[PDB]
Amino acid sequence: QLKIIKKELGLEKDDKDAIEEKFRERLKELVVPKHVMDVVDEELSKLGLLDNHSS
Amino acid sequence: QLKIIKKELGLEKDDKDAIEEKFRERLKELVVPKHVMDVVDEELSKLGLLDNHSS
């Protein structure tokens, strides 16, 4: 089913996902406390669901 | 089909009710006084109907 997902990829230009991967890449190197990983994980999930143009 | 696979049955973008659920489960163990046991219920019942982007 995952392959079926990638099979289509008719957009490949998410404006919310690019932000998600940028911040997630920026975070890999650091020795993050789990506290901030748990928080940032939540706020990533909320940024990843929100409308692109809301304040 | 994508929404019925990645968003419905996929592991991404859980429903708002999951947010309700994670709160409810947090309540399931500790014994709250009956007094506040209601208030949370009404807050939930109002909360579900809300548009998520509303402040």
Side-chain angles (χ1 to χ4, degrees), chain B:
Chain B
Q1 275 168 320
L2 192 148
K3 307 329 288 212
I4 291 314
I5 289 173
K6 186 72 160 145
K7 176 172 188 185
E8 184 178 2
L9 296 174
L11 296 174
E12 183 178 2
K13 294 180 182 297
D14 223 310
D15 289 345
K16 308 300 88 171
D17 182 15
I19 305 302
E20 174 279 349
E21 172 39 46
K22 58 173 289 308
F23 294 134
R24 188 75 68 86
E25 54 79 11
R26 208 192 303 185
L27 201 74
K28 279 184 132 284
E29 305 75 1
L30 71 168
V31 62
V32 301
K34 65 88 187 182
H35 185 273
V36 301
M37 185 65 204
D38 61 5
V39 165
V40 67
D41 185 282
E42 295 84 4
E43 290 322 327
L44 277 178
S45 300
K46 185 79 196 214
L47 191 148
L49 297 173
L50 292 192
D51 268 322
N52 291 259
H53 289 104
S54 63
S55 168

Tab-separated table of all heavy atoms in Angstrom, chain B:
chain	number	residue	atom	x	y	z
B	1	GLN	N	-8.926	7.727	-2.909
B	1	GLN	CA	-8.284	6.491	-2.477
B	1	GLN	C	-7.123	6.801	-1.555
B	1	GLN	O	-6.887	6.091	-0.570
B	1	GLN	CB	-7.786	5.716	-3.688
B	1	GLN	CG	-8.821	4.848	-4.336
B	1	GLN	CD	-8.360	4.329	-5.676
B	1	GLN	OE1	-7.740	5.054	-6.457
B	1	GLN	NE2	-8.597	3.047	-5.924
B	2	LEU	N	-6.383	7.857	-1.877
B	2	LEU	CA	-5.272	8.267	-1.036
B	2	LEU	C	-5.770	8.638	0.354
B	2	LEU	O	-5.175	8.247	1.363
B	2	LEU	CB	-4.548	9.430	-1.700
B	2	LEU	CG	-3.193	9.839	-1.132
B	2	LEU	CD1	-2.337	10.370	-2.273
B	2	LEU	CD2	-3.302	10.889	-0.025
B	3	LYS	N	-6.888	9.364	0.422
B	3	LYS	CA	-7.430	9.750	1.722
B	3	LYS	C	-7.980	8.546	2.464
B	3	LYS	O	-7.918	8.484	3.695
B	3	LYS	CB	-8.534	10.794	1.586
B	3	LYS	CG	-8.240	12.061	0.777
B	3	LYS	CD	-6.782	12.553	0.804
B	3	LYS	CE	-6.395	13.154	2.150
B	3	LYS	NZ	-5.387	14.242	2.027
B	4	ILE	N	-8.476	7.563	1.722
B	4	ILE	CA	-9.050	6.360	2.308
B	4	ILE	C	-7.925	5.413	2.698
B	4	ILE	O	-8.154	4.504	3.507
B	4	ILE	CB	-10.046	5.701	1.315
B	4	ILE	CG1	-11.362	6.519	1.071
B	4	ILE	CG2	-10.506	4.285	1.797
B	4	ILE	CD1	-12.136	7.102	2.228
B	5	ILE	N	-6.678	5.666	2.275
B	5	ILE	CA	-5.567	4.780	2.593
B	5	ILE	C	-4.557	5.441	3.527
B	5	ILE	O	-4.335	4.951	4.636
B	5	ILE	CB	-4.891	4.327	1.277
B	5	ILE	CG1	-5.827	3.355	0.545
B	5	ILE	CG2	-3.476	3.725	1.539
B	5	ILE	CD1	-5.388	2.932	-0.855
B	6	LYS	N	-3.986	6.584	3.132
B	6	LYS	CA	-3.008	7.186	4.042
B	6	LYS	C	-3.655	7.984	5.166
B	6	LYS	O	-3.142	7.988	6.291
B	6	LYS	CB	-1.967	8.039	3.311
B	6	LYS	CG	-0.828	8.551	4.290
B	6	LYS	CD	0.114	7.378	4.701
B	6	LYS	CE	1.487	7.776	5.227
B	6	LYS	NZ	1.986	6.857	6.301
B	7	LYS	N	-4.767	8.657	4.895
B	7	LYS	CA	-5.380	9.477	5.928
B	7	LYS	C	-6.410	8.741	6.754
B	7	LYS	O	-6.547	9.037	7.945
B	7	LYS	CB	-6.022	10.697	5.261
B	7	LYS	CG	-6.801	11.637	6.172
B	7	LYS	CD	-7.208	12.890	5.412
B	7	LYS	CE	-7.821	13.926	6.331
B	7	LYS	NZ	-8.332	15.096	5.569
B	8	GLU	N	-7.098	7.763	6.180
B	8	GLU	CA	-8.113	7.037	6.932
B	8	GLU	C	-7.499	5.839	7.635
B	8	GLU	O	-7.546	5.731	8.865
B	8	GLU	CB	-9.249	6.576	6.023
B	8	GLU	CG	-10.381	5.883	6.787
B	8	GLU	CD	-11.497	5.479	5.888
B	8	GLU	OE1	-11.359	5.700	4.678
B	8	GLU	OE2	-12.516	4.961	6.386
B	9	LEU	N	-6.898	4.952	6.854
B	9	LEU	CA	-6.294	3.732	7.349
B	9	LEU	C	-4.786	3.817	7.455
B	9	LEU	O	-4.166	2.868	7.940
B	9	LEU	CB	-6.675	2.591	6.406
B	9	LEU	CG	-8.165	2.224	6.322
B	9	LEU	CD1	-8.391	1.181	5.237
B	9	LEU	CD2	-8.754	1.727	7.637
B	10	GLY	N	-4.183	4.919	7.037
B	10	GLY	CA	-2.759	5.053	7.165
B	10	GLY	C	-2.435	5.561	8.534
B	10	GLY	O	-3.305	5.939	9.317
B	11	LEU	N	-1.151	5.586	8.814
B	11	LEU	CA	-0.648	5.983	10.113
B	11	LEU	C	-0.510	7.493	10.269
B	11	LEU	O	-0.152	7.948	11.360
B	11	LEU	CB	0.704	5.303	10.318
B	11	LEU	CG	0.661	3.768	10.386
B	11	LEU	CD1	2.100	3.237	10.439
B	11	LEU	CD2	-0.195	3.264	11.558
B	12	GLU	N	-0.788	8.272	9.227
B	12	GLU	CA	-0.666	9.721	9.239
B	12	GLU	C	-1.999	10.444	9.475
B	12	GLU	O	-3.075	9.915	9.189
B	12	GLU	CB	-0.051	10.133	7.893
B	12	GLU	CG	0.231	11.596	7.715
B	12	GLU	CD	0.881	11.963	6.398
B	12	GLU	OE1	1.096	11.075	5.555
B	12	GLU	OE2	1.179	13.162	6.208
B	13	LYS	N	-1.894	11.671	10.008
B	13	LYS	CA	-3.011	12.591	10.305
B	13	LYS	C	-4.182	11.970	11.073
B	13	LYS	O	-5.263	11.721	10.539
B	13	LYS	CB	-3.508	13.305	9.044
B	13	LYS	CG	-2.474	14.250	8.468
B	13	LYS	CD	-2.938	14.958	7.223
B	13	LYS	CE	-1.824	15.838	6.674
B	13	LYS	NZ	-1.425	16.921	7.604
B	14	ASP	N	-3.927	11.708	12.350
B	14	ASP	CA	-4.965	11.144	13.199
B	14	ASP	C	-6.086	12.158	13.420
B	14	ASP	O	-5.881	13.374	13.391
B	14	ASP	CB	-4.400	10.739	14.560
B	14	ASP	CG	-4.920	9.407	15.025
B	14	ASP	OD1	-6.154	9.219	15.002
B	14	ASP	OD2	-4.102	8.552	15.420
B	15	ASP	N	-7.276	11.630	13.669
B	15	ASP	CA	-8.459	12.440	13.888
B	15	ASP	C	-8.394	13.169	15.215
B	15	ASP	O	-7.694	12.783	16.147
B	15	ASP	CB	-9.733	11.605	13.836
B	15	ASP	CG	-10.067	11.140	12.438
B	15	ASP	OD1	-9.497	11.674	11.464
B	15	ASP	OD2	-10.916	10.240	12.309
B	16	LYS	N	-9.131	14.271	15.257
B	16	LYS	CA	-9.204	15.107	16.449
B	16	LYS	C	-9.730	14.301	17.624
B	16	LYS	O	-9.424	14.605	18.790
B	16	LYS	CB	-10.054	16.331	16.157
B	16	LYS	CG	-9.610	17.097	14.885
B	16	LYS	CD	-8.171	17.633	14.899
B	16	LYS	CE	-7.127	16.613	14.388
B	16	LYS	NZ	-5.815	17.251	14.227
B	17	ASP	N	-10.572	13.305	17.342
B	17	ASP	CA	-11.085	12.487	18.416
B	17	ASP	C	-9.925	11.785	19.111
B	17	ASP	O	-10.029	11.450	20.287
B	17	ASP	CB	-12.084	11.489	17.844
B	17	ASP	CG	-12.723	10.623	18.902
B	17	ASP	OD1	-12.621	10.948	20.106
B	17	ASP	OD2	-13.340	9.608	18.524
B	18	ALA	N	-8.836	11.488	18.387
B	18	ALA	CA	-7.663	10.926	19.044
B	18	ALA	C	-7.135	11.892	20.100
B	18	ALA	O	-6.613	11.468	21.132
B	18	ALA	CB	-6.558	10.597	18.044
B	19	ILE	N	-7.230	13.202	19.831
B	19	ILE	CA	-6.818	14.207	20.811
B	19	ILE	C	-7.691	14.092	22.052
B	19	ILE	O	-7.201	14.035	23.199
B	19	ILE	CB	-6.886	15.623	20.206
B	19	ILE	CG1	-6.053	15.736	18.913
B	19	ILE	CG2	-6.427	16.654	21.225
B	19	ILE	CD1	-4.580	15.396	19.029
B	20	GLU	N	-9.006	13.988	21.822
B	20	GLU	CA	-9.927	13.721	22.925
B	20	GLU	C	-9.552	12.444	23.636
B	20	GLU	O	-9.640	12.354	24.865
B	20	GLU	CB	-11.363	13.641	22.388
B	20	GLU	CG	-12.489	13.233	23.375
B	20	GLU	CD	-12.635	11.735	23.640
B	20	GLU	OE1	-12.008	10.930	22.921
B	20	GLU	OE2	-13.367	11.375	24.580
B	21	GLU	N	-9.161	11.441	22.871
B	21	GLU	CA	-8.947	10.137	23.441
B	21	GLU	C	-7.731	10.179	24.341
B	21	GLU	O	-7.740	9.593	25.421
B	21	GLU	CB	-8.778	9.112	22.323
B	21	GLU	CG	-8.361	7.717	22.757
B	21	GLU	CD	-9.029	7.265	24.038
B	21	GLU	OE1	-10.259	7.447	24.152
B	21	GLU	OE2	-8.322	6.767	24.936
B	22	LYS	N	-6.646	10.800	23.867
B	22	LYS	CA	-5.422	10.817	24.657
B	22	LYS	C	-5.632	11.574	25.954
B	22	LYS	O	-5.127	11.164	27.015
B	22	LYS	CB	-4.270	11.436	23.878
B	22	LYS	CG	-4.504	12.843	23.410
B	22	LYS	CD	-3.292	13.491	22.794
B	22	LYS	CE	-2.208	13.808	23.826
B	22	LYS	NZ	-2.707	14.581	25.000
B	23	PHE	N	-6.521	12.564	25.927
B	23	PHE	CA	-6.877	13.183	27.188
B	23	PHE	C	-7.672	12.214	28.042
B	23	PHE	O	-7.387	12.071	29.237
B	23	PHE	CB	-7.647	14.477	26.940
B	23	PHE	CG	-6.838	15.574	26.272
B	23	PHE	CD1	-7.366	16.287	25.216
B	23	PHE	CD2	-5.563	15.906	26.714
B	23	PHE	CE1	-6.643	17.299	24.611
B	23	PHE	CE2	-4.842	16.917	26.112
B	23	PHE	CZ	-5.384	17.614	25.061
B	24	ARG	N	-8.688	11.574	27.452
B	24	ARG	CA	-9.580	10.718	28.225
B	24	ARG	C	-8.788	9.608	28.892
B	24	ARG	O	-8.960	9.334	30.084
B	24	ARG	CB	-10.658	10.129	27.321
B	24	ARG	CG	-11.763	9.369	28.064
B	24	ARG	CD	-12.748	10.290	28.768
B	24	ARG	NE	-13.541	11.046	27.796
B	24	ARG	CZ	-14.672	10.619	27.224
B	24	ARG	NH1	-15.196	9.429	27.501
B	24	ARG	NH2	-15.297	11.393	26.349
B	25	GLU	N	-7.895	8.976	28.123
B	25	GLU	CA	-7.096	7.879	28.649
B	25	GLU	C	-6.225	8.402	29.753
B	25	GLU	O	-5.930	7.668	30.696
B	25	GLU	CB	-6.241	7.166	27.594
B	25	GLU	CG	-5.311	7.986	26.752
B	25	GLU	CD	-3.999	8.399	27.404
B	25	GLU	OE1	-3.649	7.886	28.483
B	25	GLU	OE2	-3.304	9.253	26.824
B	26	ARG	N	-5.763	9.656	29.621
B	26	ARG	CA	-4.960	10.206	30.694
B	26	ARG	C	-5.770	10.267	31.969
B	26	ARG	O	-5.231	10.055	33.052
B	26	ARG	CB	-4.509	11.627	30.390
B	26	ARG	CG	-3.211	11.978	31.066
B	26	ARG	CD	-2.948	13.454	30.988
B	26	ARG	NE	-2.918	13.975	29.635
B	26	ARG	CZ	-2.604	15.228	29.321
B	26	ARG	NH1	-2.286	16.128	30.249
B	26	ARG	NH2	-2.612	15.591	28.052
B	27	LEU	N	-7.075	10.480	31.847
B	27	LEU	CA	-7.954	10.506	32.995
B	27	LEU	C	-8.329	9.130	33.512
B	27	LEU	O	-8.774	9.019	34.657
B	27	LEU	CB	-9.236	11.217	32.600
B	27	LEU	CG	-10.062	11.793	33.737
B	27	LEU	CD1	-9.392	13.039	34.293
B	27	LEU	CD2	-11.473	12.082	33.255
B	28	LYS	N	-8.126	8.081	32.721
B	28	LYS	CA	-8.727	6.794	33.041
B	28	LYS	C	-8.175	6.141	34.291
B	28	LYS	O	-8.869	5.321	34.893
B	28	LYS	CB	-8.563	5.832	31.878
B	28	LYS	CG	-9.593	6.051	30.808
B	28	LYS	CD	-9.474	5.031	29.696
B	28	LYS	CE	-10.825	4.442	29.357
B	28	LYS	NZ	-11.242	3.452	30.380
B	29	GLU	N	-6.962	6.485	34.698
B	29	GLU	CA	-6.263	5.765	35.753
B	29	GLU	C	-6.458	6.465	37.088
B	29	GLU	O	-7.035	5.900	38.020
B	29	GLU	CB	-4.766	5.644	35.410
B	29	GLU	CG	-4.429	4.996	34.038
B	29	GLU	CD	-4.684	5.916	32.846
B	29	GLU	OE1	-5.114	7.060	33.109
B	29	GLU	OE2	-4.514	5.497	31.686
B	30	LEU	N	-5.978	7.690	37.188
B	30	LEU	CA	-6.137	8.464	38.403
B	30	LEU	C	-7.608	8.736	38.653
B	30	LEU	O	-8.380	8.953	37.716
B	30	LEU	CB	-5.373	9.784	38.272
B	30	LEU	CG	-5.894	10.884	37.322
B	30	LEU	CD1	-5.144	12.165	37.597
B	30	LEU	CD2	-5.828	10.502	35.866
B	31	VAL	N	-7.992	8.714	39.924
B	31	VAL	CA	-9.385	8.871	40.323
B	31	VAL	C	-9.603	10.357	40.593
B	31	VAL	O	-9.125	10.911	41.584
B	31	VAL	CB	-9.759	7.979	41.510
B	31	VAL	CG1	-8.974	8.290	42.801
B	31	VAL	CG2	-11.263	8.075	41.770
B	32	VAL	N	-10.273	11.022	39.663
B	32	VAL	CA	-10.591	12.432	39.837
B	32	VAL	C	-11.786	12.548	40.765
B	32	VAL	O	-12.584	11.605	40.851
B	32	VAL	CB	-10.885	13.145	38.511
B	32	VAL	CG1	-9.690	13.048	37.599
B	32	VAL	CG2	-12.163	12.619	37.845
B	33	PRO	N	-11.940	13.646	41.493
B	33	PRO	CA	-13.189	13.850	42.214
B	33	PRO	C	-14.318	13.955	41.215
B	33	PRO	O	-14.124	14.388	40.078
B	33	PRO	CB	-12.980	15.175	42.952
B	33	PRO	CG	-11.567	15.511	42.787
B	33	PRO	CD	-11.089	14.845	41.568
B	34	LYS	N	-15.495	13.493	41.639
B	34	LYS	CA	-16.673	13.514	40.777
B	34	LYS	C	-16.977	14.921	40.307
B	34	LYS	O	-17.566	15.110	39.236
B	34	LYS	CB	-17.875	12.965	41.550
B	34	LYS	CG	-18.327	13.812	42.774
B	34	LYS	CD	-19.356	14.949	42.486
B	34	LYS	CE	-19.586	15.799	43.697
B	34	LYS	NZ	-20.609	16.833	43.404
B	35	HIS	N	-16.617	15.906	41.134
B	35	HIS	CA	-16.926	17.292	40.876
B	35	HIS	C	-16.351	17.712	39.542
B	35	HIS	O	-17.069	18.212	38.679
B	35	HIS	CB	-16.359	18.132	42.004
B	35	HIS	CG	-16.724	19.566	41.904
B	35	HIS	ND1	-15.987	20.467	41.173
B	35	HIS	CD2	-17.753	20.261	42.438
B	35	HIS	CE1	-16.549	21.659	41.255
B	35	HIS	NE2	-17.620	21.562	42.021
B	36	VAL	N	-15.056	17.485	39.342
B	36	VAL	CA	-14.451	17.873	38.075
B	36	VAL	C	-14.664	16.828	37.004
B	36	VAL	O	-14.422	17.116	35.827
B	36	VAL	CB	-12.926	18.056	38.193
B	36	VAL	CG1	-12.603	19.105	39.213
B	36	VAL	CG2	-12.190	16.737	38.515
B	37	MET	N	-15.167	15.645	37.371
B	37	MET	CA	-15.392	14.600	36.387
B	37	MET	C	-16.395	15.015	35.335
B	37	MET	O	-16.343	14.523	34.204
B	37	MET	CB	-15.857	13.325	37.088
B	37	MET	CG	-16.005	12.116	36.167
B	37	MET	SD	-14.437	11.577	35.460
B	37	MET	CE	-15.000	10.736	33.981
B	38	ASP	N	-17.301	15.912	35.675
B	38	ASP	CA	-18.283	16.343	34.699
B	38	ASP	C	-17.687	17.389	33.769
B	38	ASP	O	-17.769	17.237	32.543
B	38	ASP	CB	-19.560	16.802	35.414
B	38	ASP	CG	-19.351	17.965	36.342
B	38	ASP	OD1	-18.237	18.503	36.377
B	38	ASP	OD2	-20.304	18.328	37.051
B	39	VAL	N	-17.099	18.446	34.359
B	39	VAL	CA	-16.686	19.654	33.649
B	39	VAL	C	-15.893	19.306	32.410
B	39	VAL	O	-16.136	19.843	31.320
B	39	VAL	CB	-15.857	20.546	34.593
B	39	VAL	CG1	-15.075	21.637	33.811
B	39	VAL	CG2	-16.725	21.124	35.718
B	40	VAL	N	-14.972	18.357	32.559
B	40	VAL	CA	-14.213	17.886	31.418
B	40	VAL	C	-15.123	17.305	30.358
B	40	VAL	O	-14.868	17.466	29.157
B	40	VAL	CB	-13.187	16.854	31.927
B	40	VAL	CG1	-13.861	15.582	32.455
B	40	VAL	CG2	-12.201	16.499	30.858
B	41	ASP	N	-16.217	16.663	30.776
B	41	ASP	CA	-17.110	16.057	29.803
B	41	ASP	C	-17.735	17.135	28.944
B	41	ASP	O	-17.764	17.031	27.710
B	41	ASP	CB	-18.177	15.198	30.475
B	41	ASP	CG	-19.028	14.470	29.480
B	41	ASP	OD1	-19.931	15.101	28.897
B	41	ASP	OD2	-18.784	13.263	29.272
B	42	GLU	N	-18.272	18.172	29.599
B	42	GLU	CA	-18.924	19.216	28.802
B	42	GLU	C	-17.929	19.941	27.927
B	42	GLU	O	-18.274	20.346	26.806
B	42	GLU	CB	-19.662	20.276	29.615
B	42	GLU	CG	-20.856	19.768	30.390
B	42	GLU	CD	-20.476	19.173	31.708
B	42	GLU	OE1	-19.292	19.227	32.038
B	42	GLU	OE2	-21.355	18.636	32.409
B	43	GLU	N	-16.701	20.123	28.416
B	43	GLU	CA	-15.708	20.772	27.580
B	43	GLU	C	-15.440	19.951	26.345
B	43	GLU	O	-15.370	20.492	25.243
B	43	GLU	CB	-14.405	20.980	28.351
B	43	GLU	CG	-14.388	22.014	29.481
B	43	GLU	CD	-15.187	23.278	29.224
B	43	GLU	OE1	-15.282	23.724	28.064
B	43	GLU	OE2	-15.735	23.828	30.197
B	44	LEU	N	-15.407	18.634	26.498
B	44	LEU	CA	-15.175	17.772	25.352
B	44	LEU	C	-16.325	17.867	24.372
B	44	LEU	O	-16.124	17.953	23.148
B	44	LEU	CB	-15.017	16.330	25.821
B	44	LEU	CG	-13.643	15.900	26.328
B	44	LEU	CD1	-13.686	14.454	26.804
B	44	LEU	CD2	-12.540	16.106	25.304
B	45	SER	N	-17.541	17.793	24.909
B	45	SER	CA	-18.721	17.773	24.066
B	45	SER	C	-18.837	19.049	23.256
B	45	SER	O	-19.202	19.007	22.076
B	45	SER	CB	-19.953	17.588	24.942
B	45	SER	OG	-19.878	16.369	25.652
B	46	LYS	N	-18.492	20.192	23.851
B	46	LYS	CA	-18.454	21.397	23.036
B	46	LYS	C	-17.288	21.333	22.065
B	46	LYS	O	-17.409	21.775	20.917
B	46	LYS	CB	-18.388	22.648	23.916
B	46	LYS	CG	-18.456	23.997	23.144
B	46	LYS	CD	-19.896	24.340	22.734
B	46	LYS	CE	-19.970	25.434	21.657
B	46	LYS	NZ	-21.157	26.345	21.761
B	47	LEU	N	-16.155	20.788	22.513
B	47	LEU	CA	-14.926	20.921	21.750
B	47	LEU	C	-15.003	20.194	20.426
B	47	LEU	O	-14.394	20.642	19.450
B	47	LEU	CB	-13.747	20.387	22.553
B	47	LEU	CG	-12.343	20.679	22.005
B	47	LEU	CD1	-11.342	20.832	23.148
B	47	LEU	CD2	-11.838	19.586	21.049
B	48	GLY	N	-15.772	19.105	20.360
B	48	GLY	CA	-15.760	18.319	19.133
B	48	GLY	C	-16.365	19.081	17.969
B	48	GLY	O	-15.910	18.962	16.830
B	49	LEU	N	-17.397	19.868	18.241
B	49	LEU	CA	-18.119	20.569	17.193
B	49	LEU	C	-17.315	21.720	16.589
B	49	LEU	O	-17.599	22.132	15.460
B	49	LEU	CB	-19.441	21.073	17.768
B	49	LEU	CG	-20.398	19.974	18.241
B	49	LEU	CD1	-21.599	20.578	18.935
B	49	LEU	CD2	-20.847	19.105	17.072
B	50	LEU	N	-16.313	22.226	17.312
B	50	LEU	CA	-15.522	23.376	16.878
B	50	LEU	C	-14.741	23.115	15.597
B	50	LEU	O	-14.224	22.018	15.370
B	50	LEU	CB	-14.553	23.747	17.999
B	50	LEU	CG	-15.102	24.319	19.312
B	50	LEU	CD1	-13.965	24.871	20.143
B	50	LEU	CD2	-16.154	25.393	19.106
B	51	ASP	N	-14.646	24.150	14.760
B	51	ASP	CA	-13.621	24.178	13.726
B	51	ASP	C	-12.236	24.324	14.323
B	51	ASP	O	-12.000	25.144	15.211
B	51	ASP	CB	-13.859	25.342	12.764
B	51	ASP	CG	-14.706	24.961	11.564
B	51	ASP	OD1	-14.560	23.840	11.031
B	51	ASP	OD2	-15.540	25.793	11.152
B	52	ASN	N	-11.313	23.529	13.802
B	52	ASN	CA	-10.036	23.376	14.470
B	52	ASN	C	-9.176	24.612	14.348
B	52	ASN	O	-8.347	24.877	15.222
B	52	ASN	CB	-9.318	22.171	13.908
B	52	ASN	CG	-9.997	20.901	14.293
B	52	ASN	OD1	-9.556	20.227	15.204
B	52	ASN	ND2	-11.092	20.570	13.618
B	53	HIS	N	-9.379	25.392	13.297
B	53	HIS	CA	-8.577	26.580	13.087
B	53	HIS	C	-9.044	27.752	13.920
B	53	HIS	O	-8.321	28.748	14.012
B	53	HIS	CB	-8.572	26.919	11.612
B	53	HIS	CG	-7.768	25.952	10.811
B	53	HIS	ND1	-8.345	24.977	10.029
B	53	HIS	CD2	-6.431	25.769	10.718
B	53	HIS	CE1	-7.397	24.257	9.460
B	53	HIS	NE2	-6.227	24.713	9.868
B	54	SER	N	-10.234	27.670	14.501
B	54	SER	CA	-10.719	28.748	15.338
B	54	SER	C	-9.831	28.881	16.569
B	54	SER	O	-9.378	27.888	17.143
B	54	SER	CB	-12.165	28.480	15.750
B	54	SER	OG	-12.257	27.304	16.534
B	55	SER	N	-9.546	30.126	16.947
B	55	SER	CA	-8.721	30.380	18.122
B	55	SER	C	-9.398	29.861	19.382
B	55	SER	O	-8.723	29.464	20.341
B	55	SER	CB	-8.437	31.874	18.251
B	55	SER	OG	-7.877	32.166	19.515
